Amino acid sequence: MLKGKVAVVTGSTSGIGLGIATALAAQGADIVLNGFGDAAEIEKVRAGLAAQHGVKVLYDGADLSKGEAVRGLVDNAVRQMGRIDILVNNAGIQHTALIEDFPTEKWDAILALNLSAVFHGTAAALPHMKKQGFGRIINIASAHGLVASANKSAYVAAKHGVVGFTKVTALETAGQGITANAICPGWVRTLLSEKQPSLQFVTPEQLGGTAVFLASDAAAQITGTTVSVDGGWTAR
Amino acid sequence: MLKGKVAVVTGSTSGIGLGIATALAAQGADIVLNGFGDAAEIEKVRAGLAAQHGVKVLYDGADLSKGEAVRGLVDNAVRQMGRIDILVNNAGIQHTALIEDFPTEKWDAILALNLSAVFHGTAAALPHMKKQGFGRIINIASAHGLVASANKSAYVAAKHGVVGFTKVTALETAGQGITANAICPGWVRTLLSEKQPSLQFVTPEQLGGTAVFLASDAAAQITGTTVSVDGGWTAR
Amino acid sequence: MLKGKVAVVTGSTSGIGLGIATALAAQGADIVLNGFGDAAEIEKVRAGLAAQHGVKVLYDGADLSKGEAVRGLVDNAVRQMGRIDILVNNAGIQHTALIEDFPTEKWDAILALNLSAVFHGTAAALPHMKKQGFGRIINIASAHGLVASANKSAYVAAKHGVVGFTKVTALETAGQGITANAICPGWVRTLLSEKQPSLQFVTPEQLGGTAVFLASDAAAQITGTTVSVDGGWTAR
Amino acid sequence: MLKGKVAVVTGSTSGIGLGIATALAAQGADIVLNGFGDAAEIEKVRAGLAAQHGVKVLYDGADLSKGEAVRGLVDNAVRQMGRIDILVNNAGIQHTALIEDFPTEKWDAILALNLSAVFHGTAAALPHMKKQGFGRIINIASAHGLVASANKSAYVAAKHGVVGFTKVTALETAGQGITANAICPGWVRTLLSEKQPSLQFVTPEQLGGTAVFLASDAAAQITGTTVSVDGGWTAR
Numbered sequence A, B, C, D: 001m002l003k004g005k006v007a008v009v010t011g012s013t014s015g016i017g018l019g020i021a022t023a024l025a026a027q028g029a030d031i032v033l034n035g036f037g038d039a040a041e042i043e044k045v046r047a048g049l050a051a052q053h054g055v056k057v058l059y060d061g062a063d064l065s066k067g068e069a070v071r072g073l074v075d076n077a078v079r080q081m082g083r084i085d086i087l088v089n090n091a092g093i094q095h096t097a098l099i100e101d102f103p104t105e106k107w108d109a110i111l112a113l114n115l116s117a118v119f120h121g122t123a124a125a126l127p128h129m130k131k132q133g134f135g136r137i138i139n140i141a142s143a144h145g146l147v148a149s150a151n152k153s154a155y156v157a158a159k160h161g162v163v164g165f166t167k168v169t170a171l172e173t174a175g176q177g178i179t180a181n182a183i184c185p186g187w188v189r190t191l192l193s194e195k196q197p198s199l200q201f202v203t204p205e206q207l208g209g210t211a212v213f214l215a216s217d218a219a220a221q222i223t224g225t226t227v228s229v230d231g232g233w234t235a236r
């Protein structure tokens, strides 16, 4: 279980992020939700999770495309929750186009959220985790952080960047009770034959369970690595 | 939990294998122990695990250096336990020497146990897992299945072979309710500064927890991949 | 040889880039130099290369930290040289610091030059290479595009990004007479015991020879991959 | 060029091996051919290469499935040629079948030739290369030494083993004027849409050129790595 621990999950108002926040809440961890969406429905989700799992759940709608906002998300999480044991950098966007047709605006946006937000969030969380003597940074990369697909240059570059950044985070925190790993999902229903051998989608629940495992003490020495949840995508 | 499931763990009379068998037993899975060692003490371990976790535990001392013996281990596990849901190919040996000084006898022995035994065990288990519609093959490779170290040619070659074999197993079983993955441990106290950034040993308990996770339904789409538990070894 | 071909090498006013531009010039390719430095001495280098190898050599001091300037470098190379057969994205910078102490300004600068410049340059060159039916994009990444080192978060993230971007470039151009690969150097004298097994530095001349090989017809089917020139860095 | 150097290429009576031996001969290196086939036609090939390139070419039909025969091939190469600067471990076989249907005889044969022969050959060559202060071991692995395909368990395991063994060889010889690398080819016409993005076959000539490059001084610091020549196979 994760009772007494605080988890911040970026982009948890829906999809994979919500699945991960839900799984962590079920383990007894207090949660800080984040992401865009309908204010009224987000409040329903927040209140629902808190009541269903008997944990404290807050919502911070910080726009993670801005570095100071990402750092602020972490700062306020610590101020209101008292600490930050788990940081799940999940928020992300995408865009398909040939490299020569790829809008610079889209390239910049994808790198800002999919990669730089991981840097800013990690930077703000580390001082706390080092002092606490405990930390779990779980970055949601992609199979595209390990291999590529045509027409997804910005996304693949950003995700590969996340994988590298994860490794550095791990090396800088090695032995300090902190681990940093990157979950690399294949397709999630948030087509299969071309990339996913199992011909089965990965689910937010499975990814939540994977995050829960990485947050456990059994994973104390799992650091600076990738955990592929892709139905065989990267095996071939 | 894993109630109603049967797990065969090779080389589980001590070290990592025993830790994995213990973790699986604690989840409610019936266990088939295997490996060399003292008959009287092995019986004590077997009886102890069965009583402590309320599961059926058997011991088969098959010499896995012989292909037919490995296949026999699986055949008898099914005959006595009724099925084989989880196969942990863990038994292994090592030998240090420069390539030009490496005894052919040692090269052959390491490949036979560290690599070929995985093939024979997997081959015998697959028909059952495919019919059952459920299977979890967990191969204990090593950080040396991904990177190398001087003077460990046979071991590194064998472990890399296991990683490749694991990927093939996954592709051949994709979507059939079966997964095949390779846990790649760093140092386990069964020196650290040179290879393991955390400067902390990996434990049999942690590896057992990792095996338990891979055996869970949350890991249904984790297949054909490696899970490094090495304190940062492969991150640098 | 590369007679009749045009090569643009970013950051070729010194170090690795100059070594690569020199090697390509020796193969008979026309060259477009680029980078910061002393105008008078750069002219001496430019004039020297042209006279020594009997090829056309131009210099464009475009500041590659700006996307439009990178695209302009390629546009003008085509206008003055008539085409662009080889694009070597080499310019890069670095900065050491713990993640929590890493200046956002430095993070942004490193990503802009080490990663985004590869995108902008590649984007501008592709239309030409596709029409020509020939292209060689050679990205100078680093061993740090495959593994990490503590205190180099921005650099490692950017270099990993380059590796991923290289793979996408290759997939989008597959079969069109164009290849895209990433040379990943270890230490170059532009300390060794910790990362480089050979205990020998990699030289600009060796990297130039590696670029020459990738530009050759023998490397027509080498695409979307990395070529490590690191004295064993990534083997362990 | 490679004048004054001796190269031994296993399985060079046809296909990739012959292409590599031919390329090396064109660089001025003396050659030792090896492999099965028609004695009369092999002699024609041998005599032809020697006359066409003005180098010494011998043929040794050692059956590399036997360790002592592999070591003998190297021993006799040194006795008749005076030294062994380049060793290309290329001979290999294959077999397709599901793991549970894979004949143990075929599994053993593939491991013996595709993997163990690399060990025996390397072991016999190393003492000479270390004394000479120069060595180039070029192992012909496959894309299947890095990724897998269903129904090729023995081959994939063996090729992954070769990649690992190559890394160890490099680490044990680091800085001694010796390098060890593994060329990993995609399809060679010795179907494409499923695995090879370029939709173009790799040729023996291209692989020969790749071997020539690795044998050059420019590749002095390229060691313990893989060089994929696969038209994009491993990029996705």
Ligand SMILES: NC(=O)c1ccc[n+]([C@@H]2O[C@H](COP(=O)([O-])OP(=O)(O)OC[C@H]3O[C@@H](n4cnc5c(N)ncnc54)[C@H](O)[C@@H]3O)[C@@H](O)[C@H]2O)c1
Residues within 6 Å of the ligand: A010, A011, A012, A013, A014, A015, A016, A017, A034, A035, A036, A037, A061, A062, A063, A064, A065, A090, A091, A092, A093, A113, A140, A141, A142, A143, A184, A185, A186, A187, A188, A189, A190
């Ligand atoms: N869906 C897949 O197949 C898949 C598989 C591999 C990896 N991933 C990764 O999973 C992560 C989550 O994506 P998803 O598939 O669940 O999609 P999603 O749209 O369901 O979730 C993305 C979340 O990001 C938040 N978000 C977007 N921009 C933001 C910003 N500027 N600031 C703050 N929050 C922002 C959204 O509000 C949303 O909650 C992404 O990083 C994605 O790249 C997805």
Ligand SMILES: NC(=O)c1ccc[n+]([C@@H]2O[C@H](COP(=O)([O-])OP(=O)(O)OC[C@H]3O[C@@H](n4cnc5c(N)ncnc54)[C@H](O)[C@@H]3O)[C@@H](O)[C@H]2O)c1
Residues within 6 Å of the ligand: B010, B011, B012, B013, B014, B015, B016, B017, B034, B035, B036, B037, B061, B062, B063, B064, B065, B090, B091, B092, B093, B113, B140, B141, B142, B143, B184, B185, B186, B187, B188, B189, B190
């Ligand atoms: N200890 C580490 O640092 C470490 C880290 C990476 C991977 N590994 C892998 O973990 C596995 C277990 O090794 P360990 O470290 O627990 O050592 P160990 O000696 O404690 O356990 C090895 C087990 O293998 C069994 N065994 C040996 N030969 C056998 C044979 N011919 N037939 C049947 N059983 C046989 C033994 O009886 C024993 O129970 C090995 O595959 C090893 O390569 C070890």
Ligand SMILES: NC(=O)c1ccc[n+]([C@@H]2O[C@H](COP(=O)([O-])OP(=O)(O)OC[C@H]3O[C@@H](n4cnc5c(N)ncnc54)[C@H](O)[C@@H]3O)[C@@H](O)[C@H]2O)c1
Residues within 6 Å of the ligand: C010, C011, C012, C013, C014, C015, C016, C017, C034, C035, C036, C037, C061, C062, C063, C064, C065, C090, C091, C092, C093, C113, C140, C141, C142, C143, C184, C185, C186, C187, C188, C189, C190
């Ligand atoms: N030196 C090493 O050990 C090593 C090994 C791995 C990879 N690399 C990579 O090699 C590449 C070249 O670096 P180097 O080691 O030769 O260093 P260097 O300083 O000798 O060369 C860098 C070049 O980049 C140019 N440059 C810098 N900023 C620029 C800008 N904004 N616009 C245009 N040009 C700019 C410089 O003028 C210079 O010619 C870099 O991408 C680096 O990351 C270096």
Ligand SMILES: NC(=O)c1ccc[n+]([C@@H]2O[C@H](COP(=O)([O-])OP(=O)(O)OC[C@H]3O[C@@H](n4cnc5c(N)ncnc54)[C@H](O)[C@@H]3O)[C@@H](O)[C@H]2O)c1
Residues within 6 Å of the ligand: D010, D011, D012, D013, D014, D015, D016, D017, D034, D035, D036, D037, D061, D062, D063, D064, D065, D090, D091, D092, D093, D113, D140, D141, D142, D143, D184, D185, D186, D187, D188, D189, D190
């Ligand atoms: N053809 C491809 O698509 C491809 C791509 C990836 C890697 N490879 C590798 O390339 C290598 C060469 O195979 P190829 O495709 O040129 O096939 P090939 O049949 O044309 O060549 C194989 C060579 O191995 C020799 N050989 C076989 N068994 C032997 C033994 N017991 N002793 C001595 N020599 C023996 C043969 O006589 C022959 O010259 C193999 O290792 C193969 O796995 C092939």
Ligand SMILES: C[As](C)(=O)[O-]
Residues within 6 Å of the ligand: A141, A142, A143, A144, A152, A155, A185, A186, A187
């Ligand atoms: C949505 As995806 C598989 O490109 O990360």
Ligand SMILES: C[As](C)(=O)[O-]
Residues within 6 Å of the ligand: B141, B142, B143, B144, B152, B155, B185, B186, B187
């Ligand atoms: C015992 As080990 C780290 O070589 O697998």
Ligand SMILES: C[As](C)(=O)[O-]
Residues within 6 Å of the ligand: C141, C142, C143, C144, C152, C155, C185, C186, C187
């Ligand atoms: C200068 As480096 C080895 O960090 O790329």
Ligand SMILES: C[As](C)(=O)[O-]
Residues within 6 Å of the ligand: D141, D142, D143, D144, D152, D155, D185, D186, D187
């Ligand atoms: C002949 As092959 C591509 O399996 O090495």
Ligand SMILES: [Mg+2]
Residues within 6 Å of the ligand: A038, A039, A040, A041
């Ligand atoms: Mg509303």
Ligand SMILES: [Mg+2]
Residues within 6 Å of the ligand: B038, B039, B040, B041
């Ligand atoms: Mg006794």
Ligand SMILES: [Mg+2]
Residues within 6 Å of the ligand: C038, C039, C040, C041
């Ligand atoms: Mg001046």
Ligand SMILES: [Mg+2]
Residues within 6 Å of the ligand: D038, D039, D040, D041
């Ligand atoms: Mg005849």
